[PDB]
Amino acid sequence: LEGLEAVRKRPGMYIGSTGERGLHHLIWEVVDNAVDEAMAGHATKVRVRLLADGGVEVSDDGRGIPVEMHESGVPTVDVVMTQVGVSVVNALSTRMEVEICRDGYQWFQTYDKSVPGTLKQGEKTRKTGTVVRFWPDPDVFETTTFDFETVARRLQEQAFLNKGLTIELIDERDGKHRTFYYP
Ligand SMILES: CNc1cc(F)cc2c1[nH]c1nc(Oc3cnc(C)nc3)nc(N3C[C@@H]4[C@@H](N)[C@@H]4C3)c12
Ligand SMILES: [Zn+2]
Ligand SMILES: [Zn+2]
Ligand SMILES: [Zn+2]
């Protein structure tokens, strides 16, 4: 967790600012990982929800973040959320939730002020994919309001670059919705 403490100590080092543009770094990172699964993991659908409480949910129907034991002796999902680019989202969020469908099972993990909980094996499923929820820390960010039009423009770009990918955007704050798809 030394990397995460470094991000929390100097957030602007990692996301440039703690204003609106800094806040949107977090949604870009999680969206990017979901969209990466379209080229790499045969995902057909990405969904982004702007939650009523300021949180964000991103989901894909890709391979699912690996849950197998990493060489560092913890589930790979914990390595991802502490070491890869998306670990900045974990560092600067009060909490994150991860749901994974892979290897014939649902899996659930939580991060509480970036600290991993205990990976839980849930029910059997033939489905695959990943859901990440995160709640930006208002102690870090001078604004916590995501901009629907800013997010829409990024998702339209990502649909155009990933032909056949459906991207759904839902604003739970006001009900606005958009679906992006290029054949
Ligand atoms: C909402 N969707 C979402 C959010 C998120 F924060 C991270 C991921 C994600 N979907 C993901 N899907 C996968 O499937 C993979 C990738 N590679 C292999 C070998 N197996 C399965 N892997 C993921 N990750 C591990 C590593 C990627 N290069 C990063 C992130 C993410
Ligand atoms: Zn990427
Ligand atoms: Zn493949
Ligand atoms: Zn596949």
Numbering used by the authors: 20 to 102, 123 to 213, 245 to 253
Tell me, in the authors' exact words, what the paper reports:
Gyrase is a type II topoisomerase and the only enzyme that can catalyse the introduction of negative supercoils into DNA;3,5 it is composed of two subunits, GyrA and GyrB, which form an A2B2 complex in the active enzyme. Gyrase is an essential enzyme in bacteria and has been extensively studied as a target for antibacterial agents;6 gyrase has been described as an effective drug target for the development of new anti-TB agents. Other compounds, such as the aminocoumarins (e.g. novobiocin), inhibit gyrase through targeting the ATPase domains of gyrase and topo IV, located in the N-terminal domain of GyrB (and ParE), thus preventing supercoiling. In addition, we present crystal structures of the GyrB N-terminal ATPase sub-domain from Mycobacterium thermoresistibile bound to one of these compounds (Redx03863) and also to novobiocin, demonstrating that this novel compound class inhibits via a binding pocket and resistance mechanism different from that of novobiocin.
Using cross-seeding from crystals of the novobiocin complex, crystals of Redx03863 bound to the 21 kDa fragment were obtained, which diffracted to a resolution of 1.5 Å. The structure was solved using molecular replacement from the novobiocin complex structure. This new crystal structure demonstrated that the binding mode of Redx03863 partially overlaps those of novobiocin and 5′-adenylyl-β,γ-imidodiphosphate (ADPNP). However, in contrast to novobiocin, Redx03863, is more deeply buried and shows a greater correspondence in atomic positions to ADPNP, most notably in the overlap of the pyrrolopyrimidine and adenine rings. In the Redx03863 complex, there is only a water-mediated interaction between Arg141 and the ligand. Indeed, when we made site-directed mutations to Ala and Gln at Arg141 in M. tuberculosis GyrB, the mutated proteins showed only weak supercoiling activity and were susceptible to inhibition by Redx03863, i.e. this water-mediated contact does not greatly affect the interaction of Redx03863 with gyrase. When we selected for spontaneous resistance mutations to Redx03863 in M. smegmatis, the only mutation that we could isolate was Gly83Ser; no mutations at Arg141 were found, again suggesting it is of minor importance. In relation to Gly83 to Ser, the presence of a side chain at this position would cause steric clashes with the neighbouring structure and most likely displace and/or destabilize the loop bearing residue 83, which also contains several other important ligand-binding residues, namely Arg82, Ile84 and Pro85. We found that none of these mutant enzymes showed any supercoiling activity. This suggests that selecting resistance mutations to Redx03863 is difficult without compromising enzyme activity, which is a feature in favour of exploiting these compounds as leads for antimicrobial chemotherapy.
